[PDB]
């Protein structure tokens, strides 16, 4: 519940910001954005822009004309991905504020929606003056893609009967007014849905949370967007990449663990894909597209891509037999600093592995091909319109079973990589005159809440309705939460020195009942957390609170109480610092009335400072060390042992209802957690 | 039964060496070895080695702990090769043998049986001072792989139950006592282990001397093992491998014609492998894996490996179609002297393909990968514990058709490049002023002996029993064999010259009848013998008898017979020069009552010495020339009709019993060839 103060000019710039995304699907022929964009001449802007060869460059797709209103827009799409990253370049390189909005009014007023959006977001994101603004949290933006067609379609009814038939009826089919505006309780997918025992899953991979997570992700650094911007992380970029999989594929490993799922299974381009998923979408011209079971992957629709993609892995292969080869025009050495770097963007086919300042047309992406083949739709009409999967956007990817399939096989790609790093040596770890006698945990305990947001952007207002900025209509839906819990940490030290803490936590058995081997387990530890304490000699101890771990975060405010909160000249400093981590909601996977064992790793080592990053991303510790150091690449786990490491096993619990179910019955009231 | 002389210092070492083969699957608390052990103080020895990096490593694998006893070693996984090699280095860097002999005690006692073997083993026949010494037969000193399970079983009831229940009874299950020693007969395999026409030749392919002589390859230079030791060799490497399968295929070939069998078939990863084959043989924990017939090779467990494999074989193919290239750190043209070296090392992937002195864990190996699809094992429950094939050990390869299957892929890809090679002209070739007028062949006739050898190091003996060195235990079963016979050569030479004198077995007719063309019979011929003859002008005529060819031995005597020699003062001469060619029991193939027709290949080439070889192996011609010479690569034909060359048809016969189990009936006295 914290926030950050903020003063008259901040709170009216900010108004301006969110007022574009109100009835987002609509135009009110009432509203100030309308205004400015009649009032913006788009041919004689020129001097609003810094870099003029980007307008000429705009001005001219728009003179030949952008993808309509009312189709679905992808970035996975060639020519919509040009005018998409044209209008942003615009919307970056406007000189000012005031330019910078009424380019925005005018693409909010005449240009697709989806396409709109989406480099609305990114340039907010990007934009220096504009950056330390607060954006509305991507499921309230786009509703569409975060609310399953059940409940998709009450909300349709509910509006054209203009409230419920009979109050009694509709509360049986969980749909009530509080306050004046509707709430619509939503379950998560049947099997209809997910046909396979993934359904067991859904409470992940259909939250919220998770979703708009990786919608942060790559609006923070697009594949297609060198790192100019960013400059020394150029460096990183690639480094990234690994970290943010590797660690999200470990986040969902351990959802399977306590449902009893074990390994994301293999697949194989010349072989059926076992696991099919029915994606519960539709857009404008078509309801999604379904991959059944066993859905083969090898068929004439789909040969041609398939070659592509092979022979791209098996490049791959290539580069990691020979060691040090010409390719991409540097030559490139696996035992070298850059070579992280270079595997990470060689597999995101990143605009850096070129020479691009924005990525061409004409570089074949091996993420591109992939998603487009198990997302198993029938091939585009034409370049404006495709049958759209859950692969097809960033909003949607995480719920696709197929999607962890991906890239848990290019995560494996770049380990296999690993082989050519060198192992961290004893004293390399060793944290001299430094030990950790004993770690201690409060109890961890997962539960299940109730969780709103308002979906109104997906539903439609009258001419009249319209004026007002209308926004009735709320999802509630059981996410998974955890309790706050303190980590103590007991310190003997030597000396006074700077020590980073940090603390992952990870699998401790098998499916097997076996105690996992370090040399099996590193990839599988997720970053909890990491800081920097002065460290006094004698006996300390150290506490942390759940609360300020470094990679979580609170949810996000509607836009509704983001304006309350300005009315009184305030923001979510959250929403405001860090918008781009994942929810605390779902640091912990859920547990079981048991208790389900897991390891914490507690790892202290000399903090050695650097000038700090320039940061697209997660402020990580302020060190020459890599991204989830020391689990950024394969152990000898004998040289794991130190005294200022602490593996301690650790039991997650749950409370109230095993199942979000059992919160959406009507007239059942569930066990909820105290 | 040809022996050496031998002196009371060799004889008393020689001795030493043999002590530690002595109830291998045990230890004496009582032998000296025991004593020498408990002695030697491994963490005081740095003093012993002439390599102090080479113990420091070895002492630190120590620390952490090796393979623990009772589990199967094989050099085929990463971590056991790591040790392996380890306590190799401590065996070969011992400064004297006295040193050796301590550290070959130690691991006799505290280390797992096979790993300690197969580094001991390999270490004699490298060490410097130790070789020259003698080594029991592979199959004495690891019976577990050169014995069925029948008997193997038999053993272990005959052991238990301290002799026989009622001795006619088991003289009925083919067993006898025979001076104070078993004897069980064995016969060769099943359709129940062999469930296909391959049954047909298992008498080739189970046969305890073809196996050794794989293994003792192996052991004279393992693939994890540089050149160093061998210097001007080095260069050579990559064309023996070439030469020591396409040699070993020509000889499984030949078996195949005279029992009707055709040409070895072909495979892919990506279909199912028609050829199954059911190992006789288990672990102290599994069974071995059986490979069933229409096996599928391309599943989930398999996929990963089989995009290596197929990437391995494909880049091959761009090395081809390029013809220049820059390829592991060196610049290689495929129509240069070093390209038939490359080549080879590339398909073993040799620690001379790169930098390493000694193979590095991470650099994947094209023939580990094959052998984990070929063997169909699940994979290994951790990394000390794996399902063993026969395609694990090189004592049990030849066993299964997928060896010749993969073996003869990797010799045709080769082939493949040896288009790049140019065919040699008829000057080249022609030998001026000498011609072969004639040459005649003695009878040449198979048949079957049986042979007997002690496999009483996979039978166990009590605490007492150990005292005595106890060995009651001998397999008898009827080999391959053929009668002694001499080629004589009739000879016309103008002037006196010196000439090397070789000569080939090869297929006279296809599966159809048709004479083979040379063009496509080259890679079918085996060398059987190589020399130097002083020619005199005018005409001679050169005898040979079949008991000189260089390229085969006699048997090996078991260890107690070896003994036998030492007490005064001898050693079998043949496993002192040359333990690791073909026995020559094998050297013909199985023929028939009719005669079955085969080339003997006769050629005669000027000498033209250079400096001697030290050689790794088979002492081959002290020439310039290829090894396999002139059939080391395409011919064409024409050039093939030179004044000293001569293809003579020949015809092998057979006498006595035509199948090997006629020999081992109880009751049944067989037709025995006189
Ligand atoms: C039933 O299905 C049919 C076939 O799919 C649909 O017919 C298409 O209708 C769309 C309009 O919705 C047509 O696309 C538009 O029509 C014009 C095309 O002009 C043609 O002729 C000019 C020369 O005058 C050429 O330059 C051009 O190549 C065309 O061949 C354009 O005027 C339109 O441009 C407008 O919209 C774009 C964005 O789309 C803006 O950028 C512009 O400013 C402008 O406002 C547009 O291109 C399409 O041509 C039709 N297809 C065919 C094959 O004829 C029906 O719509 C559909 N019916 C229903 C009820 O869905
Ligand atoms: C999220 O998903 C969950 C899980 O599927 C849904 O929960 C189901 O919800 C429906 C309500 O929508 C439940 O159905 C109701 O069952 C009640 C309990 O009945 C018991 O006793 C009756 C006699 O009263 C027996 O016949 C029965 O066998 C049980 O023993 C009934 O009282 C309800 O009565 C209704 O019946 C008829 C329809 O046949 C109506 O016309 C009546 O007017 C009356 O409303 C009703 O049938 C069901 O139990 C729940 N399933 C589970 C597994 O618990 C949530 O609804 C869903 N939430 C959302 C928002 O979708
Ligand atoms: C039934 O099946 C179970 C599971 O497979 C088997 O249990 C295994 O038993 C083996 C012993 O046979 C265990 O391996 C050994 O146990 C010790 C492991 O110590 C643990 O704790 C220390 C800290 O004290 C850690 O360092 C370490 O990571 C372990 O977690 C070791 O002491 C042993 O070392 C000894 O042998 C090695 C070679 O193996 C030598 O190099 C050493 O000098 C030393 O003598 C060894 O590592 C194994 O841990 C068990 N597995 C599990 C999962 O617990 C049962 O044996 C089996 N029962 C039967 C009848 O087969
Ligand atoms: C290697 O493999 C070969 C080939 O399989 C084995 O050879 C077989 O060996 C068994 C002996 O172990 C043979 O079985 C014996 O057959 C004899 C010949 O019998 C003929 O006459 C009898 C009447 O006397 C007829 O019934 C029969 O049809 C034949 O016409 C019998 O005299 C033997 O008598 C035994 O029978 C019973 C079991 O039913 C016993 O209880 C008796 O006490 C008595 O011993 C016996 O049945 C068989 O012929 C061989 N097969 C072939 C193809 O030749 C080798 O044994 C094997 N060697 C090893 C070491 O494994
Ligand atoms: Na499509
Ligand atoms: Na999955
Ligand atoms: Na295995
Ligand atoms: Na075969």
């Given amino acids: 519940f914290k926030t950050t103060p903020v003063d008259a000019a901040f709170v009216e710039k900010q108004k301006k910001i969110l007022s574009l995304f109100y009835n987002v699907n609509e135009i009110?022929?009432?509203?100030?954005?309308?205004?400015?964009?009649?009032?913006?001449?788009?041919?004689?802007?020129?001097?609003?822009?810094?870099?003029?060869?980007?307008?000429?460059?705009?001005?001219?797709?728009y003179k030949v004309g952008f993808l309509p209103k009312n189709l679905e827009f992808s970035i996975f799409y060639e020519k919509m991905r040009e005018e998409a990253i044209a209008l942003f370049k615009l919307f970056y390189y406007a000189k000012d504020f005031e330019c910078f909005y009424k380019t925005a009014c005018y693409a909010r007023v005449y240009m697709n929606q989806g396409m709109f959006l989406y480099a609305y977001y990114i340039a907010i994101i990007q934009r220096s003056d504009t950056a330390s603004f607060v954006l509305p949290a991507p499921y309230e933006a786009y509703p569409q893609y975060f609310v399953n067609m059940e409940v998709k379609n009450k909300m349709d009814y509910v509006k054209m009967m203009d409230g419920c038939l009979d109050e009694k009826i509709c509360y049986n089919y969980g749909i009530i007014k509080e306050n004046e505006q509707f709430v619509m309780y939503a379950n998560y997918s049947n099997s209809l849905t997910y046909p396979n025992n993934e359904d067991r899953i859904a409470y992940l991979t259909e939250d919220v949370g998770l979703?708009?997570?990786?919608?942060?992700?790559?609006?923070?650094?697009?594949?297609?967007?060198?790192?100019?911007?960013?400059?020394?992380?150029?460096?990183?970029?690639?480094?990234?990449?690994?970290?943010?999989?590797?660690?999200?594929?470990?986040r969902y490993y351990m959802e399977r663990l306590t449902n009893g799922l074990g390994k994301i299974p293999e697949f194989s381009w010349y072989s059926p894909l076992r696991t099919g998923y029915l994606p519960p979408f539709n857009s404008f011209y078509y309801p999604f597209a379904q991959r059944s079971n066993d859905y083969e992957l090898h068929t004439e629709k789909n040969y041609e891509e398939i070659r592509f993609l092979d022979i791209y892995e098996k490049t791959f292969f290539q580069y990691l037999q020979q060691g040090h080869f010409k390719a991409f025009d540097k030559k490139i050495d696996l035992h070298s600093s850059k070579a992280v770097n270079?595997?990470?963007n060689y597999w995101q086919t990143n605009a850096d592995l070129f020479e691009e300042d924005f990525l061409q047309f004409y570089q074949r992406s091996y993420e591109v091909n992939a998603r487009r083949v198990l997302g198993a739709a029938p091939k585009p009409f034409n370049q404006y319109t495709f049958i759209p999967s859950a692969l097809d956007f960033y909003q949607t990817s995480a719920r696709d079973p197929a999607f962890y399939q991906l890239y848990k096989r290019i995560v494996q790609y770049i380990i296999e990589f690993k082989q050519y790093q060198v192992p961290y040596t004893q004293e390399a770890l060793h944290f001299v005159g430094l030990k950790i006698s004993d770690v201690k945990v409060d109890?961890?305990?997962?539960?299940?809440?109730?969780?709103?947001?308002?979906?109104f952007n997906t539903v439609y207002f009258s001419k009249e309705e319209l004026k007002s900025s209308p926004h009735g209509y709320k999802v509630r839906q059981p996410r998974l939460n955890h309790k706050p819990f303190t980590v103590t940490i007991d310190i003997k030290s030597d000396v006074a020195t700077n020590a980073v803490v940090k603390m992952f936590l990870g699998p401790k058995y098998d499916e097997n009942g076996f105690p996992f081997s370090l040399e099996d387990n590193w990839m599988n530890f997720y970053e909890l957390d990491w800081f920097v304490q002065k460290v006094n000699p004698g006996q300390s101890q150290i506490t942390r609170s759940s609360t300020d771990f470094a990679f979580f975060k609170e949810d996000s405010l509607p836009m509704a109480e983001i304006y309350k909160l300005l009315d009184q000249g305030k923001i979510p400093t959250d929403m405001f610092?860090?918008?781009?981590?994942?929810?605390?909601?779902?640091?912990?996977?859920?547990?079981?009335?048991?208790?389900?064992?897991?390891?914490?790793?507690?790892?202290?080592?000399?903090?050695?400072?650097?000038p700090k990053e320039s940061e697209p991303f997660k402020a990580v510790v302020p060190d020459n060390k890599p991204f989830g150091y020391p689990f950024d690449r394969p152990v000898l786990p004998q040289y794991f042992k130190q005294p200022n490491m602490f593996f301690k096993k650790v039991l997650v619990y749950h409370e109230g209802e095993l199942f979000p179910y059992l919160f959406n019955i009507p007239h059942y009231t569930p066990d909820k957690a105290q």
Same sequence: chains 1, 2.
């Fill in 28 to 61: 009110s022929y009432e509203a100030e954005y309308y205004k400015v964009a009649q009032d913006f001449n788009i041919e004689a802007s020129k001097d609003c822009y810094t870099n003029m060869k980007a307008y000429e460059n705009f001005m001219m797709m």
């Fill in 577 to 610: 610092n860090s918008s781009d981590t994942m929810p605390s909601r779902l640091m912990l996977p859920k547990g079981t009335y048991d208790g389900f064992p897991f390891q914490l790793f507690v790892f202290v080592y000399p903090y050695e400072p650097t």
């Fill in 211 to 250: 979703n708009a997570y990786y919608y942060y992700f790559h609006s923070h650094l697009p594949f297609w967007w060198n790192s100019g911007k960013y400059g020394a992380f150029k460096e990183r970029r690639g480094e990234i990449y690994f970290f943010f999989y590797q660690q999200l594929l470990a």
């Fill in 443 to 455: 109890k961890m305990v997962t539960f299940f809440d109730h969780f709103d947001f308002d979906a």
């Fill in 342 to 344: 270079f595997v990470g």
